């Protein structure tokens, strides 16, 4: 079964399962590359389910743009297997960005300040860290991101 995501007026169907299966293959390896055990980017005071539905779609779109603009394409590993998986994750994430963009075009991805506020916070955390550490850390945090999306009833 697909995951029906309730983002206020924006409702999309996502293949959460495909992405989780792809990521479980690399979680351990990736998370091992991340030395900054004291910094959490997706902090939990910014969880999606805790967000007013009107604002969820906006938040999620930015988070995806974050990952697509500066995580997936920049994670460095010599391991071909790993690289292929990462392409899977990114293209899977792209289908979702595509639906959110539609919601946006239909004027149902309103960016309110609860949304911008929580994104800036996340973006801040990510910007604290030195580049490669940053991407390594966010890639390793897909499990939180995918759960945030599963959480939203």
């Amino acid at each position: 079964a697909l995951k029906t995501l309730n983002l206020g007026s924006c409702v999309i169907a996502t293949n959460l399962q495909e992405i989780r299966n792809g990521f479980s293959e690399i979680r351990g390896s990736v998370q091992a590359k991340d030395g900054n055990i004291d910094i959490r980017i997706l902090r939990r005071t910014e969880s999606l389910q805790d967000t007013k539905p009107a604002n969820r779609c906006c938040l999620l779109r930015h988070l995806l743009r974050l990952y697509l603009d500066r995580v997936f394409k920049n994670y460095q590993t010599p391991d071909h297997y790993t690289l292929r998986k990462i392409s899977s994750l990114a293209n899977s994430f792209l289908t979702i960005k595509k639906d959110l963009r539609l919601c946006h075009a239909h004027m149902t991805c309103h960016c309110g300040e609860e949304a911008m506020k929580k994104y800036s916070q996340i973006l801040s955390h990510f910007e604290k860290l030195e580049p490669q550490a940053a991407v390594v850390k966010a890639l390793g945090e897909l499990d939180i991101l995918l759960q945030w999306m599963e959480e939203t009833e």
Binding site: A32, I37, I39, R40
Partner: protein, 204 residues
Amino acid sequence: KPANITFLSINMKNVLQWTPPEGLQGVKVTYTVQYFIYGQKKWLNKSECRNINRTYCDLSAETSDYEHQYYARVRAIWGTKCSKWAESGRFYPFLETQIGPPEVALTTDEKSISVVLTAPEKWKRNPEDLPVSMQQIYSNLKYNVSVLNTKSNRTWSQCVTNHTLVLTWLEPNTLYCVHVESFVPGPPRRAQPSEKQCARTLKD
């Protein structure tokens, strides 16, 4: 210098595990363990695991929160010569914990066997505490029921959510073997031996 650090987590009872270091004999090494909470700042002591003889430490109380991730380290001790600090991987109990089997209870008829499962319980904090159905933590918890007819070597599965299932229209004086696995849809987890119970239908 211990190694092979890992959690074994079934039903939220989370247990840290390592295997002895490398010492030819050093028959007396003890172990101390610290636990860290991802995204927070301070490593923490575990008193009941300061200097112990075992290679396993129960961290269920320290890692009870569903929203957090944890790490754990352990080192080996001799005199005051301590080999470094052995560090686990990021551990996420809410997604990683094995869901255990419901306990199965078979009762019979001549045509019909009734299966009643009682949902797996979550690790209890205080011995006197309010029991918790894993099916409250995972509201979408389903059971996969397998029925084997020993007479025919025939077998068939089915998924259910209701705690009670009546198998009807069965061959009489036949012995049927039922076993049930628990599954939460979501991230793939480590499975867990289903519970395997038998029952014979009554004679014609």
